[PDB]
Paper text:
β-Scorpion toxins are polypeptides of 60–76 residues stabilized by four disulfide bridges. They bind with nanomolar affinity to an extracellular receptor (site 4) of voltage-gated sodium channels. β-Toxins induce a hyperpolarizing shift of the voltage-dependence of activation via a voltage-sensor trapping mechanism, whereby toxin-mediated interactions stabilize a persistently-activated conformation of the channel domain II voltage sensor. This extensive reticulation establishes the tertiary structure that presents the bioactive surface as well as conferring significant thermostability and resistance to proteolysis.
In this study we show that the Bj-xtrIT β-scorpion toxin can be expressed in its natively-folded conformation by secretion of the polypeptide into the oxidizing environment of the E. coli periplasm. Instead, periplasmic co-secretion of the four bacterial chaperone proteins DsbC, DsbA, SurA and FkpA encoded by the pTUM4 plasmid enabled robust toxin over-expression. Purified Bj-xtrIT-(His6) toxin at a concentration of 10 mg/ml was mixed 1:1 (v/v) with 0.2 M NaCl, 0.1 M Bis-Tris; pH 5.5, 29% PEG 3350. Recombinant Bj-xtrIT-(His6) has both the βαββα-fold and C1–C4, C2–C6, C3–C7, and C5–C8 disulfide connectivity of the native fold. An all-atom structural superimposition of Bj-xtrIT-(His6) with the untagged Bj-xtrIT structure shows that there is a root-mean-square deviation (RMSD) of 0.45 Å. Localized denaturation of the α-helical regions could account for the temperature-dependent changes observed by SRCD signal, but overall the protein displayed significant thermostability that is consistent with a correctly-reticulated toxin structure.
Author numbering: 1 to 72
The structure:
């Protein structure tokens, strides 16, 4: 398993801003219901999931981004 920003059919991450950035429910629902991950939340403007299947495409990210998204 892995963590990351899952990509949709068009290769785009799921955007999240405003309340959907402060409250994790929107991204947690996308992560679990659409991507079958364990959980998720909004990290720096896009839905970040925990426990995605290894084969699920995730968006490119710097090592500092993964560390930041993982530590919260």
């Amino acid at each position: 398993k892995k963590n990351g920003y899952p990509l949709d059919r068009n290769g785009k991450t799921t955007e999240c801003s405003g309340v959907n950035a402060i409250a994790p429910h929107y991204c947690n629902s996308e992560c679990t219901k659409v991507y079958y991950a364990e959980s998720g939340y909004c990290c720096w403007g896009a839905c970040y999931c925990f426990g995605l299947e290894d084969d699920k495409p995730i968006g490119p990210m710097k090592d500092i981004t993964k560390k930041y998204c993982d530590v919260q």
